[PDB]
């Protein structure tokens with residue numbers, strides 16, 4: 082069973098998502114993260130290609146967990162009487178982007194460009210797999226410090242991607258779009274672009290732009306740090322009040338600020354090593 086298959090290490094973190102432990106797969110010593118989610122705390126349920134009742138998080142992770150290293154991979158899952166247990170890949174050494182920005186302050190634009198580009202590629206992978214993350218933020222991004230590779234985590238607030246309106250949201254409010262705040266309605270892709278604007282501002286300024294609902298609704302972006310005109314333009318574009326005024330992923334990646342991105346290994350060599 083699960084208890085013999087894995088060696089439990091220390092608790093890495095806990096919160097709205099549940100409890101995550103460091104671990105080692107006993108067969109090949111592979112580093113893993115063991116996430117526990119109480120059944121009574123799971124509101125969104127779904128079903129696998131076969132039809133088993135599992136948390137939506139398990140459905141979404143299976144849909145995105147293949148080849149590409151931009152999303153944390155689900156290695157296995159187990160059902161207990163009162164909880165679900167998820168075995169996830171664990172990079173080592175690792176640091177989440179929130180901790181990284183807290184320690185190092187506002188990121189140099191070359192570093193933010195590399196990081197932002199990788200988040201965009203990861204989000205595009207999710208969308209191509211029919212998955213909407215809904216909680217893109219610094220806390221949900223892991224940095225593989227040796228490889229300079231970023232990984233999206235916590236699909237616990239996610240949903241299957243659709244072209245119709247979403248009327249439910251349980252992600253982070255300060256990353257949520259004005260249409261959600263005002264009307265309790267949003268479309269997946271344009272809401273994801275808004276959160277990407279919040280994230281980019283956070284990378285280059287060292288803090289999020291808006292705290293209150295009134296600020297989100299006004300959508301007036303003030304720069305507290307020195308940020309290039311091209312970067313400011315891209316941020317203000319992702320943060321357009323009207324969802325239809327926001328750039329598509331293609332338009333973000335073709336933006337003049339996004340040109341000449343460093344490869345992840347070059348990024349680790351210059352900024353992380």
Ligand SMILES: Nc1cc(-c2ccc(Cl)c(Cl)c2)[nH]n1
Nearest residue numbers: 093114153170171234235236
């Ligand atoms: N899909 C996921 C992935 C994680 C996760 C959180 C924290 C760590 Cl240190 C790791 Cl390795 C993974 N939580 N939920």
